[PDB]
Every structure is written in C-alpha cells, then in structure tokens.
Amino acid sequence: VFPVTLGPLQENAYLVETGEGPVLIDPGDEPEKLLALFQTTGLIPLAILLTHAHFDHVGAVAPLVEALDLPVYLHPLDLPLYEGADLAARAWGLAIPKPPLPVRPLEEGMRLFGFQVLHLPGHSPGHVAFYDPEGAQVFSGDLLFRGSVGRYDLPGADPKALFASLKRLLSLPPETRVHPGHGPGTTLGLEARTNPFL
Ligand SMILES: [Fe+3]
Numbered sequence: 001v002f003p004v005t006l007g008p009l010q011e012n013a014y015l016v017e018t019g020e021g022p023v024l025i026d027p028g029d030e031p032e033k034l035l036a037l038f039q040t041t042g043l044i045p046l047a048i049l050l051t052h053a054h055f056d057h058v059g060a061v062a063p064l065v066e067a068l069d070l071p072v073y074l075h076p077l078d079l080p081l082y083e084g085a086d087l088a089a090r091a092w093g094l095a096i097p098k099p100p101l102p103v104r105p106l107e108e109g110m111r112l113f114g115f116q117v118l119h120l121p122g123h124s125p126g127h128v129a130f131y132d133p134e135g136a137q138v139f140s141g142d143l144l145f146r147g148s149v150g151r152y153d154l155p156g157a158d159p160k161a162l163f164a165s166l167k168r169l170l171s172l173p174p175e176t177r178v179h180p181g182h183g184p185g186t187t188l189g190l191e192a193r194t195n196p197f198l
C-alpha cells in the first residue's frame with residue numbers, strides 16, 4: 001500500500017499490491033511524483049482505478065496513461081463528470097490535463113484485482129468503493145473521512161444518496177481500515193461512534 005498525497009488539494013492516491021499485483025487508485029495529480037514513485041517502488045500499476053471522477057482524483061490519469069498505456073476503470077455513471085473534470089478544476093482556479101478516453105466500466109458486485117466493487121453514490125453518481133477483504137480494508141474515496149463525510153452539494157451529489165450509501169459502508173467489519181481520498185485514515189468502528197454525520 002503506497003498511500004501518497006498529490007495535487008494542490010492533497011488527495012490520497014494509493015498503490016495497492018494484490019494477487020494480480022499492482023494497481024493505482026485515484027492518480028489525482030503530480031505524475032512525476034507518481035512516475036518517480038514507481039522508479040523506486042519497482043511496482044508499476046497494471047491498471048488505474050477511480051473511486052469517482054472528480055478532478056482532484058483524476059488529474060494525473062492522462063499523463064500516466066500516455067506513459068504506461070494503463071487501462072482506466074471508472075463507473076459509467078461518472079463519465080459525464082470525468083469528461084468535464086478539467087473545467088471543474090478551473091472553478092477552483094486550478095488546472096488538469098483532460099482525462100483520456102476510453103475507460104473500462106466499473107459495476108456493483110464486480111470483482112477485480114482481489115477487490116470487490118461497491119457502488120456507493122451520493123458524493124457523485126458513479127462513486128464506488130474498493131473493498132479488500134484479504135486486506136481487511138476499503139478504499140472509499142471521498143465517501144468517508146476521519147470525522148466527516150463527502151460533500152453533497154457539488155454537481156451530481158445527493159445527500160439522501162450519500163446517506164444510504166454510507167449506511168451500507170458502515171455495516172461491514174467495524175475493524176475495517178478506511179483509506180479516504182483526503183486526510184488521515186480511520187475505521188468504520190471509530191467513525192460509527194465519533195463522526196458527527198452518524
Ligand atoms: Fe470528490
């Protein structure tokens with residue numbers, strides 16, 4: 001697990017090692033920091049996985065793809081966002097290289113790279129979580145934070161959605177390690193009793 005923090009908004013990209021080996025979750029920005037991270041790691045990612053298509057999570061995809069021809073997995077419901085992520089970036093006074101097409105569709109119940117894909121909308125229409133039971137953990141993007149939860153006013157978000165989606169998450173192993181797209185890690189158990197959103 002190569003937690004690594006990219007981009008002006010400090011998002012949390014992850015290199016994970018599975019049975020089928022290395023994958024990269026949410027290459028947010030700073031390819032070089034990412035490309036150079038591989039220089040040393042030795043582990044090159046067999047595929048880029050996206051929890052959602054928000055610009056702060058997909059800003060490095062273009063570069064990485066044009067350098068290692070990795071396929072890009074994303075839930076189809078986020079395509080529209082994904083395709084418009086670069087303009088979204090400019091709403092923050094920032095800028096990303098428009099994410100490349102095509103992409104391979106993610107899907108509820110789908111198994112890949114040891115992970116078990118859960119569709120958990122709310123923060124966005126195509127937001128998913130990557131559950132690693134062999135890892136005892138979960139890469140849940142902007143869904144769950146240490147003491148907070150994903151925004152629900154960004155275009156495409158929905159509180160009621162985010163809420164049913166969270167309740168789902170919070171019914172897995174309390175001891176499950178949360179790997180969020182921003183800030184310190186945590187656990188479903190910890191958040192259950194501490195988070196002001198629960
Ligand atoms: Fe987000």
Ligand SMILES: [Fe+3]
Binds near residue numbers: 011056057142181182
């Ligand atoms: Fe984010």
